[PDB]
């Protein structure tokens, strides 16, 4: 009954004919073939926590002029530096339903990363997907929906990598919550567990939901993946061969490299054989001075436990990702910041406190990304309710209410890793953040607008001030705009009992009681919500005194300007909620696991709900919805008509057959153990730094590993060291990453007309849903969408395609995608429940 993860070996090696990777492969081959074993180990092993400048860094190869590779957070900003931008969070980006904006954000991020000397930007995020709305880090990702998220991953990645930086799809996989993600962190919170939470996911659910968006990332050409902290069926993701070897590298033919999350790598030989390619930040645990790779990897190659073909492939994947995005060994942008301090001068080697020099150049990489940020946040703002009060036009009297309207009195970067819920909520907390160059609060932008218009403007920037608030908002003609929030983030930070994950789905800082009080005192109350995910609006949303409600998510640096643009109709809102607003906590049907459920061993997160999370659950159970997935209003109206479906002629879905090549080796290495000894007369051994060298020619003593001495055959599973040609999986694509290319054959083109039946120009977000028709299938699933500009009175065409994959189901008996015999239907409309146009697939 304890969930089990099958062995899948050997770890697949790169394919020289993989489309998109052919040129990268050859550049990697020419480079890797020149390398000594120590130099290959330098590539694969991080230099340690705090070792130099970036969040993580590899060893350098200074013989060939390769500077150390810089791995830097975050998905929405370059973390821990200055003169960068802070972009809107993934969840706000997802809410745009706008491919172009997703690409532009990705590109701008990559430009900032490139300008700092970053090699790999640690984003975007398809895990967590959003199994449960209390998930602390859901806001870093995109949507609960696998299609929207998959598209957002692909667009973001294409942008970042077009800007010349490697992207990293994380976290792979099943890190849906922060509770019990790490042993030490759990123990310091009073949870005595010996291993991290295990996500136990059935094969169908894996293929149709959690894996799906990462496959889109693979097909978009993502250079790297990050394996998760958590386990999958009680094997840690970074040594999980089912995950890394089979699903990622075999079935979906991934050609890039897998890096560990920071302290997610727990074993040397076992992880490498299971598909891990880079150990970040390089040490066993932060500041340990030791590594599961480094010296140990050198020794494992020297003693035979790790084959040469395997380490050669790790270096090939790392270098091929580097070359794929256009980085060169000659013209590397120097690392021009230090993560560990904003000081211009300090130790290059931070943990060791050595090599004092200039470590921050304070390079301005912001360009004109401010206005792009302002635009994305406005387009990802969801108008949930409007009885006529919006847009605002020369109002007599604005009363802006709430702490979330105002500044953090200690400044927008006053708290490390954004760990306060003081002032306006620009982004959440944790590693998925960066330092603001500024943070425009609603109060600043709304005042300036009011003064320009001759509107009266007063604000009370506290949630608990009923005397003052009542006296203000109860006056004649007041338009009360109440800003309220909820917050969440990464598990290393805790605010008021919220350990990463949210304890509840209410507003913070007495937000709910504030909104009830203001709406009881003022019949023109407008509520703006800054939240990482849904909160329960049930007790107050239906008050007619609340004339409008907006969810503005995590807008990033231009918050105040974005919301003012929407409030006054400079942007006509089109953004759609990328999750469901349920009536209760229980209506969601999933929740965070807050208490260990397996004694002192690994807690078990059984995904018994299957694919029925968010709107799939709400539709199937008919649970209480306030606002459905894909819902959002505009200041105009739209009419749907004229649905048409054109059937395409396609060939049969043919199983992929044949063999891989035998695993190649690139270059050779000396057999003299003395050649691998630490070169002490060349440079000093730096404290806590992670090196490839042995301390002496005694291999056993050099390991410092009390269990040293066993061979692959007695501690790894069968075929872990098998470098012979391997049969291809029928679901794989021959030379085609992302699965059998026949999956992406277009089977239908769907079209419909959209007419703007109101007075003003606006964007519409038509959506395409499919009913796959089986009794265990969701009622409808998202399969396409667009964002289209329509003038008053104008008619525009929505056009979208359905691939074979889009109408298939994973058949676990077959281990492939099948189109089931059940009648499928197509729906098109402005939301998951406004299914205006319907037609059966012909
Ligand atoms: C879901 O999860 C959420 C996240 O975890 C969770 O959110 C949390 O909710 C809790 C509970 O609501 C929040 O904590 C509460 O915060 C309240 C507000 O605190 C601030 O304001 C107070 C009152 O301010 C007025 O009075 C002051 C002096 O008298 C003046 O200085 C002010 O200017 C202000 O005056 C105005 O209002 C007056 C009337 O109120 C009016 O006459 C006057 O004219 C004017 O209009 C301040 O006192 C308070 O200051 C404290 O804290 C600050 C730190 O910020 C310190 O600097 C101060 O020294 C001081 O200690 C804040 O600025 C609090 O009122 C509330 O306190 C009460 O409850 C706590 C419970 O722990 C008691 O310890 C405390 O003694 C109080 O008890 C009394 O009332 C309660 C409630 O009715 C009652 O049960 C109890 O028996 C007793 O009667 C509390 O601290 C918390 O902030 C939220 N967290 C986050 C992170 O946002 C949410 O609840 C969850 N939801 C669910 C459903 O599970
Ligand atoms: C976490 O744990 C999860 C739970 O265990 C786990 O999910 C499981 O994932 C594995 C794959 O990793 C699945 O294994 C398959 O099992 C198939 C049999 O499944 C039936 O029996 C099971 C046992 O009783 C049932 O549990 C299962 O029920 C599930 O599905 C039902 C609906 O179908 C549903 O009602 C249930 O509720 C439940 O959800 C089901 O009834 C088995 O067929 C399959 O074998 C193929 O694939 C293997 C590779 O894994 C091959 O080794 C094997 O040889 C088979 O492939 C060959 O044959 C196929 C057709 O028969 C061909 O299509 C293939 O191409 C292939 O053909 C080769 O051989 C031919 C000759 O024989 C030759 O001609 C060809 O050329 C070629 O060489 C596989 O073992 C398992 O079912 C999943 N279970 C569930 C519940 O989801 C999850 O993966 C774990 N996650 C992690 C991260 O570890
Ligand atoms: C050459 O040099 C190298 C480098 O110095 C030397 O390398 C060292 O070699 C020693 C052995 O001499 C290694 O110690 C051994 O490690 C193994 C693996 O430990 C890790 O994985 C455990 C889980 O194992 C399963 O899954 C992995 C894949 O993830 C797979 O490799 C295994 O075969 C096993 O597979 C089974 O389960 C799979 C998943 O479900 C299935 O798919 C599969 O079918 C199988 O059913 C895990 O438990 C372990 O976790 C512990 O340790 C980590 C720290 O590493 C800690 O974080 C955890 O909390 C746990 O405490 C690891 O992650 C391990 O299995 C061995 O343990 C057995 O044997 C010892 C006796 O030595 C017993 O005490 C144990 O109880 C158990 O029976 C053993 O610990 C060492 O890791 C390795 N060092 C490095 C840096 O790589 C090598 O020795 C040299 N060789 C020569 C000839 O010189
Ligand atoms: C695997 O990856 C690792 C990690 O990247 C590699 O390890 C590094 O290798 C490089 C090059 O082989 C080492 O750099 C050399 O460092 C020595 C020693 O410098 C230290 O000690 C000096 C003597 O006391 C001292 O003067 C130095 O201080 C100056 O420099 C620092 C650093 O920039 C600066 O902050 C200070 O203010 C000082 O200005 C320092 O404390 C150094 O002597 C070497 O200089 C060579 O080149 C210069 C010209 O560039 C030349 O003038 C010299 O004569 C000399 O030839 C060089 O900088 C580095 O120290 C290693 N890093 C660590 C952490 O140990 C490893 O090499 C990779 N292996 C493989 C196989 O690829
Ligand atoms: C090659 O790999 C092997 C493992 O395969 C590796 O051996 C391991 O090294 C670690 C780190 O040095 C050892 O763990 C340490 O043990 C000492 C006690 O003797 C502890 O002080 C350390 O505790 C840390 O974590 C604690 C939290 O629980 C903290 O309280 C404390 O402050 C420390 O931060 C730590 O547990 C481990 O015992 C060995 N394992 C084996 C099997 O020998 C070896 O170091 C690698 N070699 C190289 C050269 O990198
Ligand atoms: C919607 O907002 C309006 C204000 O725009 C609210 O109307 C106000 O309701 C209060 C409470 O009933 C009235 O206040 C006073 O109540 C005392 C009771 O002791 C009474 O004696 C006073 O004469 C006075 O009525 C207030 O007059 C009234 N204001 C207006 C302008 O009508 C309304 O209650 C809100 N509704 C909801 C459902 O939130
Ligand atoms: C809030 O309530 C006031 C009355 O308390 C409304 O004021 C009326 O507005 C209409 C126009 O819609 C005028 O013709 C009336 O003369 C106004 N009456 C008074 C007594 O001022 C106000 O419209 C309400 N606001 C909203 C947003 O519905
Ligand atoms: C944690 O549980 C283990 C048993 O797994 C026990 O031996 C240990 O004492 C516990 N930890 C603490 C700090 O009490
Ligand atoms: C706001 O700042 C104060 C420090 O002045 C801090 O104690 C408090 O926790 C912060 N509030 C929140 C909600 O993070
Ligand atoms: C709401 O109003 C009531 C009574 O008018 C007051 O006692 C309570 O403290 C107020 N709450 C907030 C958050 O303003
Ligand atoms: C679903 O619930 C709604 C009320 O929320 C109800 O009107 C409708 O009939 C229900 N549909 C079912 C059970 O199919
Ligand atoms: C290797 O030498 C360093 C001193 O430079 C020491 O701190 C470290 O523990 C040694 N490692 C082993 C495995 O003995």
Residue numbers in the entry: 16 to 857
In the authors' words:
In this study, we present the crystallization and structure determination of a GH3 β-glucosidase from N. crassa (NcCel3A) solved to 2.25 Å resolution. The overall structure of NcCel3A is composed of three separate domains connected by two linkers and has a high degree of N-glycosylation. The two NcCel3A protein chains form a dimer similar to those observed in ReCel3A and AaBGL1. The structural analysis further showed that NcCel3A should have a similar substrate specificity to the previously structurally and biochemically characterized ReCel3A.
